[PDB]
Structure 1
Amino acid sequence: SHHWGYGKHNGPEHWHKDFPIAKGERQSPVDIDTHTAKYDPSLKPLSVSYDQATSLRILNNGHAFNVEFDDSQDKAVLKGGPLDGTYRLIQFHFHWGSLDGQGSEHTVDKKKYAAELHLVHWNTKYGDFGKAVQQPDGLAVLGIFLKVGSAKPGLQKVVDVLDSIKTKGKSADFTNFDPRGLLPESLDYWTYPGSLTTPPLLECVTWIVLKEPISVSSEQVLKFRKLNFNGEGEPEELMVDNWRPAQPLKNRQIKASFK
């Protein structure tokens, strides 16, 4: 399935035809109504252990760019909070807008941020990512909002390699990148059961959305918007507005880690 995207003729309103789960009971993203989310005093502390993370490569996949990690040992793991067991970091990517007033997938009281970072982790009890996405507890995604303001020093290494992966299918070596440089001070979060926000839209994700956004500069997000959805020697299509809008919450409760 090479067909879907974010255009008029292949974007989010069309996805249900090839991926009927698009209209399912636990789709993402959602609007987080802060007044309705309930503090859950039973959530255990969240543990984000990135000291031994080993980044390998950065890839333009025609939808976004992925910063990929070595997930063949327990090097960079997420556990605690709403999670049972140990989830290994496989990749991070972003979703962003053409304009600073849109780009996030989750919203907070209908507020849209300029972008959203997704750190994707898979449950080690399922052995590999492909097995994990078939299970209702297969993935844990840490979602972090981006606002435009001060630069994020720890993002600049990502920004500066984007020229080398301008078009679909281009990759570049991307070693020794430390994802701790992308985390806000507070790990206060909301959590709910949901899905991938891209086809195949599998209902395998425990979402952990941080309350505190990070800040990036106008120049940093401009470099995101100079990427291309197209392949090399194809007509230039700027990689912008690669976000899915909020989906129906249905029979779900959003829990808060904080009072």
Structure 2
Amino acid sequence: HWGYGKHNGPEHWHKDFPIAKGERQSPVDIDTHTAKYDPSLKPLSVSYDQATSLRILNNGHAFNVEFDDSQDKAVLKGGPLDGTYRLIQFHFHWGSLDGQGSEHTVDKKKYAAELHLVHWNTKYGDFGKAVQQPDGLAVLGIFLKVGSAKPGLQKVVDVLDSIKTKGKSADFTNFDPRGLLPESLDYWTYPGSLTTPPLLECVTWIVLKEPISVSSEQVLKFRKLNFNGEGEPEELMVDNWRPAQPLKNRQIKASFK
């Protein structure tokens, strides 16, 4: 089935998921000289004070940190959004080397990794309904560069040994996602898709301009994870990123000058 290899990677996905070649696929290259400032865009409201993490799972493609989304505890609003979007999970994409790993690119620059905080529009009642709608999800994307350690990431890094292989999960309570955010909330926004199958065109992307810094040791621990299940041939979980897709008939808007 689908993955990130020669035989089942991004270049193959369109045979199972023909929407791969659609009009609003993600990620994209952000060309900072053609993104237009939109003074009508509001500041982003990220309200994570009551966020309730539950569990961390190796799904064979990444690891997901999952949240209780059964009430309005952690929500994204404002910016380009109408209405309220509830946090359900976050995950990352990363490289085998520090020079690649991000999904979005900025003027063709690849970062070492990219964090995705996934939120669903409460007017659709649940996640599965929301992904069927063009405004169903809002994904906050944050780039990671290698430099100083990110203290707020360490709790994640130190549980990874317990979820090494596909299908493994661990309790992951009381994790505060505010510690993964950069200082500035300046962003770019555009309409797009999920970046993994089923590649549904349901996402308002909100990509922050300012990266976070993580240390080489932190990223090294991500690269020890496995795509495989326990007692299968080891295949390191690296390069779990989809390359940039054609922008087509879209505009990328900036919240800042």
Q: TM-score, normalised by structure 1?
A: 0.99
Give the deviation of 1:209 after TM superposition. Answer: 0.1
1:191-216 CA-partner distances (Å, limit 9, x unpaired) = 00000000000000000000000000
Counterpart for residue 247 of structure 2 = 249
The SS at the match of 1:105 is: coil
Structure 2 CA distance for aligned equivalents of residues 161 and 46 of structure 1: 30
The SS at the match of 1:95 is: strand
The answer on 1:117 being equivalent to 2:115 is yes
Which blocks of at least 5 consecutive residues in structure 1 are unaligned? none
Give the deviation of 1:190 after TM superposition. Answer: 0.1
Structure 2 CA distance for aligned equivalents of residues 169 and 26 of structure 1: 31
Structure 1 CA distance for aligned equivalents of residues 216 and 160 of structure 2: 16
Structure 1 CA distance for aligned equivalents of residues 30 and 236 of structure 2: 29
Structure 1 CA distance for aligned equivalents of residues 9 and 71 of structure 2: 36
1:32-78 CA-partner distances (Å, limit 9, x unpaired) = 00000000000122100000000000000000000000000000000
The SS at the match of 1:180 is: helix
Structure 1 CA distance for aligned equivalents of residues 167 and 255 of structure 2: 39
1:169-222 CA-partner distances (Å, limit 9, x unpaired) = 000000000000000000000000000000000000000000000000000000
The SS at the match of 2:162 is: helix
The SS at the match of 2:256 is: coil
**Equivalent in 163, 176, 179 of residue 177 of structure 2:** 179
The answer on 1:227 being equivalent to 2:225 is yes
Give the deviation of 1:134 after TM superposition. Answer: 0.1
Structure 2 CA distance for aligned equivalents of residues 72 and 222 of structure 1: 34
Give the deviation of 1:159 after TM superposition. Answer: 0.2
The SS at the match of 2:77 is: strand
Percent same amino acid at aligned positions? Answer: 100
Q: How many residues align?
A: 257
Matches within 5 A, 1:128-207: 128-207=126-205
1:219-256 CA-partner distances (Å, limit 9, x unpaired) = 00000000000000000000000000000000000000
Structure 1 CA distance for aligned equivalents of residues 160 and 44 of structure 2: 31
The SS at the match of 1:250 is: coil
Structure 1 CA distance for aligned equivalents of residues 114 and 197 of structure 2: 18
Structure 1 CA distance for aligned equivalents of residues 69 and 195 of structure 2: 22
Give the deviation of 1:158 after TM superposition. Answer: 0.1
Which blocks of at least 5 consecutive residues in structure 2 are unaligned? none
The answer on 1:236 being equivalent to 2:234 is yes
1:61-96 CA-partner distances (Å, limit 9, x unpaired) = 000000000000000000000000000000000000
Structure 2 CA distance for aligned equivalents of residues 46 and 196 of structure 1: 21
